[PDB]
Symmetry: D3
Subunit: 282 residues, 6 copies
C-alpha cells in the first residue's frame, strides 16, 4: 500500500524525428503484413489522449505522487471516449490482422469501444466490471463499480444465484485472473509478432508477456514515448504518440479507423471482414 | 366452424395513466436487464397499428361478427408494414436480449420484418407459407397462399419431389405444428422472463406457454389493452398501446429501432451485435 | 357531416396495375404536381378516418365509437407519408395540401414551406400576438383555437392557442392562399384518401381542372368529384403509392423518428424519364 | 506454345431481339427461384466490360493473333474495376442464392470484388496470387505477380518456412489445381442449376463442368454473345451482354447490386443475409 | 477524321508517380479548374473510342468495325466519371467540358449546370419549339438533329429532336458559350482521353494558356497540342485519377445507378491543403 | 496571465443533472444561441489548457511544463467539438466564438462562416497583400504574425504570415466584428471551458446580458464573470454536452477526419420542442 514498489517514474521522453518516425512506421507495416499471428499489448499511454493520466509518465499518477503533486483528469471514466488507437485495434481485429489483445488497463475503454471480450485479456481488471464470487458470472456496468481491491460492491447476482458481487480491480498483493493470464500467455508464446503500445513493461508478469514472443524467433516491437524495461529485446522501438503511429499504420494497411457508436459491449468476435491484399515486400 | 368457441370478445379496454405507465415500463426495463433468457409471446394486438384488425378487441373479427358487423382492414396482407413493435423485436434478437419469439399471428409480418426463422415459432401458421406434404420443405411466398385449413394450394414441390404444396393455416380442429410447439415449450420452460404483447391468452396451448415460465420462479409480464386470461399470474401488467410501450423500452435499453428494408426472409439468426452495458440496478 | 359509410370499391388487380402505370405516365409528363391528402392516408397507422366504414362520423351515427390503434404521439408515418417525402425531395412534388390534423406530414420530415395544413395540426400552437408557431413533441391540450395555458417566448409572452379549426372557423389565410395558388398552377392534382366532401378544401383539386390540368383521385370509396377525374384508383393508398414509386424507380426512405423541417432543401438527383409516345 | 490448339476464334456474335431477351431473363429468374443449389461458371466475357479483352471474341487475344493484330487493353490488371456482373455475383452469394462459383479467369477480379475464396474455384489461376512450393500457403498480392507458368516469383514464404514463392498461372501443358477442380466438380454434379457467363466452354475440363449438372436432371443455362461448345445441351441460351442480363435478373430477384469498396480479400463466406420471399410461379 | 491509330505512349512507373504528384500540386494551387473529356474516359466501360488502336475511325479505315462490350443503356460510369463527380462536389472542379455523346456524365449524377456536352448526348432530346430538354432512360432513336417521333409535353406539342451533331452542325451556342467562358477564366485546364483533334472543342483548353493558365494533358496517344502543355501524363486515365484522388485525400463515391441532377448542390467539406513551397 | 491554478469545483450528480435540464430549457426557448469556447474543450483530446491545475501558465509558474498527449496534427475533436457541429447543423447554434488556436473547430467540419477564431489558428496562414487565407494540413511553422516563407498562389506571390496573436496584437477586425454582433443579438450565450480572463474575448458574453439575454457558464473553475451568469455548471464539458444532446434528442456525429467547410449548409430537420410552461 505504502510499501508498494512503483518502479521508475518520470523518465525523460524520447521523440524520433519525423523522417525516422515515418520510416519506422513503414517497417511496422512490413512486419504486420508478414506475420501469421499478431498480439497487441496495451497500457495506460493509449488512454492519455482521452484525458486519463498514466502512472509513470511525466504527469503520471505515481510520478506526481513522488513530487508531492496530484494527477489531473480531463474526463470521468464514464465520459471518456476511446482514442484513435483503441478504435484502430477494433478494426485490426475485425479484418483478422490482430489475433489477441492483452491490456493492463482498468479504464474499461477497450470493452466500451466494442472490442470482442473473447480476444481480450484484462490482466489488472476493469472498473465497470463486477463478478459473482459464487458462479463467476461477470457483469459489465454502464458506471464504474464503486470499489477496488476485490471487495463486495453491495449488489447480488441475478443469474436465473444471489451471490455477492465484487470488483475486479487487483490490489498490489493479488495475483492475476488465471483465465486472462493463461490466454494472454498462450497468445504471446504462439505469436510471431508482439506490439506494445503505451506500456513501460515494468509490472510482472504483464510486462513480461511480450518477451514470450521472442521464443522460436518471434519479433517484438515497442511503441512508447519513454524507455521501457525490455527496450534491448525490441526489434523495433518507436518513440512517438501512439495515435500518430496507429493512424499512419492504418493509412499504410489501407484501413479506415471505425466510428464509435458510444459504449457498447461485444462478448464474442464477429466473422472477419474483407481486408486489402498484401504488398509484394521483399 | 359455426360451433367454434370464440372466447370472451369485446371486453373493455384499460389505460394506465401516464405516470403509472412510465413507472411500469421502467420496471420492465429492470426485469429485462436482470434476465438470463427472455421469451416474447405475440398476438394479433401487435399488428392492429399496421391496419390489420385483431380477433377479440372492440373492433375485432370475432367481436364484430358477434354484433352482426364486419371487421375493417386498412391494408392488404401483402401491403402491410411491420410495426415499431415488430422492428423492436428484430433488434432485441440481434443484440442478444431476446432468446425466442412465439407468435399466434398468421399475418406473416415477423418473417417479413427479417426476424430469424430459427428463433421463431408460428404456432397457428403463416399465410405466405406453404409446405410440401411429402418432404416437409417450406416455401415463403411474396403473396398470400390462397387457401386456409391445410389445403392443397395447387402448386408442387420443386426440391432438387413434386409433392403437393399445402397451406399452414390451422383450422379449429387441427393440432399445432409439433416442431413449432416443442421449441416454444422448451423456450418458455427455460426462460426466467416471459413477456406477452397483444394477446388475450385465451387459446390453448398457445396462451398457456407464458405460464410455463412461472415454473422454477420465472417472471411473467403481460402488455395488453384488455384483460387477459392469466392476468392474476402476471408479475407486471401494462395496459397501453404496444408501440408506446416498446418505444419507451428501447429508449431505456439504449437501442435504436431498426429501419425496414421491405419484405425479407432470414432463415438463420446472424451473430449477435454489441449492446450497451447494463445499469447498476439494486 | 355528409354521406358516411358508403360501400368500398376495389379495382381488380390487372385494372389496378394498368391505372398505376397510367398515374406514373401523368407524373412523368407533368411539370407541377400537387398532392391533396385526408384521413385515408393515416388509417394504416391506426388512426381512424371520419366517413369510411368505421370512421369517426360513420361510427357516431351508429352509436359506435371510432377506434385508435395508436396515440397521436406514438403513430408512425405510413409508406404513403414517406413516399411523399421522397417525391418532394427529388423535385416531383410541387406542393402538399392536407386536411389532416394528425401531425404526421410534419413529423415525417416533410418541409413546412411546401405544405398547407388547412385544418390545423394537433402538435402546433401559435401566438395570438406575434403569430409565431411552435411544433411540440406532444399534442397541444386544446381544440378550437383556445388558450393552451402556455405563453410565447420569442425574443412577447403572448397567449398560445391551438390551431385546430372548429366547424365555424375560417381556414388559415396563409395556408389556403398558398394551396389555392398551387392548385391553380398545377397540371396534375392527385387526391389520396379524401372523400372531398368539405368546402373549401375538397374543391381545391377542381381548380387544377380549370386550365387543362389533369385530376387523379385515389380512394376506396366514392368521392364528391369522381365525375371530374381523369383517373380514379380504387384501392389502398399504401399499395398504390408503393407500386408507383417502383415505376418511378424511387425508394421509400426510412423514418428517423419525429423531425421538423421548416424549409425544402435543394432537390436530389432523380431517375431519367422513360420515352412515352 | 506455338503448337497450342486455340479453338474456334472469332465466331459471329448473336443478339436476341429485346422482347425475346426480356422473356429469357424472366425464365432465368424462374429457374433460380426453383433451384436448391445454383452454380455459376464464368469466363473472360464477364471482364470485357472493364477493359480486359477476352480470348475468342471478335477482338479477342487469340482471334487478333490469328489476324496478325494485337488485343487492346483499356486498363491494367491493377486498375481494373469489377463489373456489374462480378458485383451481382457477390450479392447472390451473400443472400444464399449462389452455392459455388467456378471461374477460368486469371484476371483476379472475383477475389478483388470480395467474393469469398472458399466458394470460389480459380481453375486457371490468379495473376495476383503466388503460392509456396513447400507449405502451399497462398498469398494474395495488391499487384500482379510478375511471372506466368508456375515459375519462381523471386520472393520467399513468411509463414511463422522460407519456401520459394511461385505464380499460379497454368501453362498449356499444366494440369489444374486439384483442390480447385475437385470442389468445382462436386458443386457442379450436385447442382440442379448451372449458369455459364461469358465462356465459350471450349477448354477441358473447365468448360465441361456445366454438363456434369445435366446429370440427375439438373438444368443448364448459357449466357454468351457467341456460340458455345455445349449450346445443344442448354435448356436456355441467352445471347446478350452479361451486364444487361445480370442487371435485369437482379431487378426481378429484388436485389440491389452492391457497391465496390475497392480491392478487398475475403477468405471465408460471411453468414447469409435476408433475401426477398419467392413468387408463386406455376 | 485526322490522324488515327498513332502509337501508344506509356510513362514508366516512377515517372508516372512523379507526374501525378505534380498534377496534385496544380489542383491544390489553382482557384479555377476546368476538365475536358473525350472518348478515352469511357473505353474502360466497354465503349470504343474513335482514333485509338481499335477506335471507330481507326478500325473503319482498316475495314474492321469497333467493338462494344456494353450497350449505352447498360454502360456504367468509370472510376474517372465518378472522381469528377466527387471533384465537383468538394469545390475542386469549376466546370466540365465533354465531347462525349455517351450519356455517362449525366447518368453519373454530375450536375448539368456545370457541364457542357458539346456534341450532344444520346439520351437527350429537345423541343424544336420551346427548346425544353428531356433526359431519357434509353437512347433517343435518331442522330443528326432529327425528329424522334415524340412531341413535347411542357404545360406545346413541339417536335422533339435528338441533340447529336453531324459533321456539318454548329455546336450548341449555350454549351459552347459557357465552356469558352470557363476555359478562359481557368488557371488550370486538364484534358482526359481526348486527342484534341476537333475544332472548336479541342482548342478550348488552349484558351486557358492565354492568361498564364496552366494546361495538363492526360492521354495514351499524342494529342494535337502536346507542345503547349505544362505536363503530359501518358497512362490510363483510371490509374491517373485514382492516384490523384488518393493524394487529394478524396474517396471515389459509389454510383446509385442512372440519376439526373440539374443543379450543383452546395459544396461539401474538403481535406485541408498541404504546404507546398 | 491572471489568476491561475484556482481550485476545481464539482457539482454533485443530482445538481449536475438538474442544471443540464435547465440548460436544455434555455436552448429550446432561445431564438439565437451563441457559444464561446476556450482551452477547456480541448483538454480531453490531450491538449493542455493555460490556467487549470496543469495548464501552460499554471505549470510555468511552478517551474513545471504543460503536457501534451497528442500533436496538434494528430489531435481529434472532442465530443464537445462534434456536438457543436451538430448544434449548428440543425439550426440550434447561431454563431461560435472561440479563443482556441488549436485548429479543432475547423478540422471538425464546423462552417467557417459561423465561427470567429479570435486568437488565430495554428493551421491557417494569410497573405499580407490580398488577405487570402489558407487552411493547411499541418501547423504553420511560425507564431506572432510572421513570414512562414511561403508565397500566395491566388490567380499575387504575397508574403504568407501565421495568424497567431502575440500579447500586443489587435484581434482580427473581421472575426471580432462578427463575434460582437452575434453576442449582442443573442438571447442566450453559453461559455464552455474558458476562465473569461482575457479582454476583449472574455467580455463578449456579457454583451448578451445587455438586452435581457441569458448567460450560462460551464467551467470546472471560477471564471471572471460568475456573478453575471444565470446558470453556472461546474463539470466536465464532455459530460455536460453529452447529457444535453440526449435531452435535445440529438446524436453526436462521427468525425470523417480533418475537413474544411467554408459555408454553413442548409439546416437539417430537428426534434419537435417540448411543452415547457
Ligand atoms: C490509468 C491511471 C489513472 N487511474 C485509474 O485508471 C484508476 C484509479 N483512479 C482514481 O482513483 C481516480 N478516479 C477518478 C474518477 C474521476 N475521473 O472523476 C472516477 O470516476 N473514479 C476514480 O477512481 N485505476 C486504479 O486505481 C487501479 C489500477 C490497478 N492496478 C492494479 C495492479 C495490479 C497488480 C500490480 N499493481 C497494480 N490493478 O488495478
Ligand atoms: C388477425 C386477424 C385478421 N385476420 C387474419 O389475420 C386472417 C383472415 N383474413 C381474412 O379472411 C380477410 N383477408 C383479407 C385480405 C385483405 N386484407 O384484403 C387478404 O388478402 N386475405 C384475407 O384472407 N387469418 C385467418 O383467418 C387465420 C386465423 C387462424 N386461426 C388459427 C387457429 C388455430 C387454432 C385454434 N383457432 C384458430 N390458425 O390460423
Ligand atoms: C482475359 C485475356 C486477357 N489476358 C490476360 O488475362 C493475361 C495475359 N495478359 C498479358 O499478357 C498482357 N498483360 C497486360 C498488362 C497490362 N494490361 O498492362 C499487365 O499488367 N499484365 C499482363 O500480363 N492472362 C494470361 O496470359 C493467362 C491465361 C491462362 N491460361 C491458362 C490456361 C490453362 C489451361 C489451358 N490453357 C490456358 N492458365 O492461365
Ligand atoms: N500518447 C502516448 N503515446 C505514446 N506513449 C505514451 C503516450 N502517453 C503515455 N505514453 C507512455 O506510456 C507508458 C505508460 O507506462 P505506465 O504509466 O507505467 O503504465 P503501464 O500500463 O505500463 O503500467 C502498468 C501497471 O502499473 C500500474 O501500477 C498499474 O497497475 C498499471 O496497470 C509511459 O512510459 C509513457 O511514456
Ligand atoms: N395497440 C395495441 N396495444 C396493446 N394491446 C392491443 C393493441 N391492439 C390490440 N390489443 C390487444 O391485443 C389483444 C389481442 O387478443 P386477440 O384478439 O384474442 O388475439 P390473439 O392473438 O390473442 O388470438 C389468439 C388466436 O385466436 C384466434 O382465433 C386466432 O387463431 C388467433 O391466432 C386484445 O386483448 C387487445 O386488447
Ligand atoms: N387505406 C386507404 N386507402 C385508400 N382510401 C382510404 C384508405 N383509408 C380510408 N380511405 C378513404 O379515405 C377517405 C377519407 O374520407 P374522410 O373520412 O371524409 O376524410 P377527409 O380528410 O376527406 O375529411 C375532411 C375533413 O372532415 C372532417 O370534418 C375533418 O375536418 C377532416 O379534415 C374515405 O372515403 C375512405 O374511403
Ligand atoms: N459482354 C459480354 N457479354 C456476353 N458475352 C460476352 C461478352 N464479352 C464477351 N463475351 C463472350 O464471352 C466468351 C468468352 O470466351 P473465350 O474468349 O473463349 O474465354 P474463356 O474464358 O471461355 O476461355 C477459356 C480459357 O481459354 C483461354 O486459353 C484461357 O486460358 C481461358 O482461361 C466469348 O464467346 C464472347 O462471345
Ligand atoms: N483508358 C484511357 N486512358 C487514357 N487515354 C485513353 C484511354 N482510352 C483511350 N485513350 C485516348 O483517348 C483519346 C481519345 O481520342 P479520340 O478517339 O479522338 O476521341 P475524342 O473525344 O478526342 O474525339 C472527339 C470527337 O471526334 C469524333 O468525331 C466525335 O465527334 C468525338 O466527340 C485517344 O487518343 C486515346 O489514346
Ligand atoms: N474538461 C473540462 N471541462 C470543463 N472545464 C474545463 C475542462 N478542462 C479545462 N476546463 C476549464 O477551462 C478553463 C480554461 O481557462 P483558460 O486556461 O484561461 O483558457 P482560455 O481559453 O480561457 O484562455 C484564453 C486565452 O489565454 C491565453 O493567453 C490564450 O491566448 C488563450 O486563448 C479553465 O478554467 C478550466 O477550469
Ligand atoms: Zn452468481
Ligand atoms: Zn417436397
Ligand atoms: Zn408571440
Ligand atoms: Zn511456405
Ligand atoms: Zn416544347
Ligand atoms: Zn495574396
Amino acid at each position: 500500500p505504502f510499501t508498494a514498489d512503483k518502479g521508475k517514474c518520470g523518465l525523460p521522453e524520447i521523440f524520433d524525428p519525423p523522417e525516422e518516425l515515418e520510416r519506422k512506421v513503414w517497417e511496422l507495416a512490413r512486419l504486420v503484413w508478414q506475420s501469421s499471428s499478431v498480439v497487441f499489448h496495451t497500457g495506460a499511454g493509449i488512454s492519455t489522449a482521452s484525458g486519463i493520466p498514466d502512472f509513470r509518465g511525466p504527469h503520471g499518477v505515481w510520478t506526481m505522487e513522488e513530487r508531492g503533486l496530484a494527477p489531473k483528469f480531463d474526463t470521468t471514466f464514464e465520459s471518456a471516449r476511446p482514442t484513435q488507437t483503441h478504435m484502430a485495434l477494433v478494426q485490426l481485429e475485425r479484418v483478422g490482422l490482430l489475433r489477441f489483445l492483452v491490456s493492463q488497463n482498468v479504464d474499461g475503454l477497450h470493452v466500451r469501444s466494442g472490442f470482442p471480450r473473447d480476444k481480450l485479456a484484462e490482466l489488472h481488471g476493469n472498473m465497470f466490471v463486477e463478478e459473482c464470487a459464487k458462479c463467476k458470472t461477470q457483469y459489465v456496468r454502464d458506471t464504474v463499480v464503486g470499489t477496488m481491491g476485490l471487495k463486495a460492491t453491495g449488489r447480488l447476482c441475478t443469474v436465473a444465484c444471489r451471490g455477492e458481487l465484487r470488483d475486479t480491480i487487483l490490489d498490489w498483493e493479488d495475483s492475476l485472473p488465471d483465465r486472462d493470464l493463461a490466454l494472454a500467455d498462450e497468445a504471446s508464446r504462439n505469436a510471431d509478432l508482439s506490439i506494445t503500445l503505451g506500456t513501460s513493461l515494468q509490472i510482472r508478469p504483464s510486462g513480461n508477456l511480450p518477451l514470450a514472443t521472442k521464443r522460436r524467433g518471434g519479433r517484438l516491437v515497442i511503441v512508447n514515448l519513454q524507455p521501457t524495461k525490455h527496450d534491448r529485446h525490441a526489434d523495433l522501438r518507436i518513440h512517438g504518440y501512439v495515435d500518430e503511429v496507429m493512424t499512419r499504420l492504418m493509412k499504410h494497411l489501407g484501413l479506415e479507423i471505425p466510428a464509435w457508436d458510444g459504449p457498447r459491449v461485444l462478448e464474442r468476435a464477429l466473422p472477419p471482414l474483407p481486408r486489402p491484399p498484401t504488398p509484394k515486400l521483399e
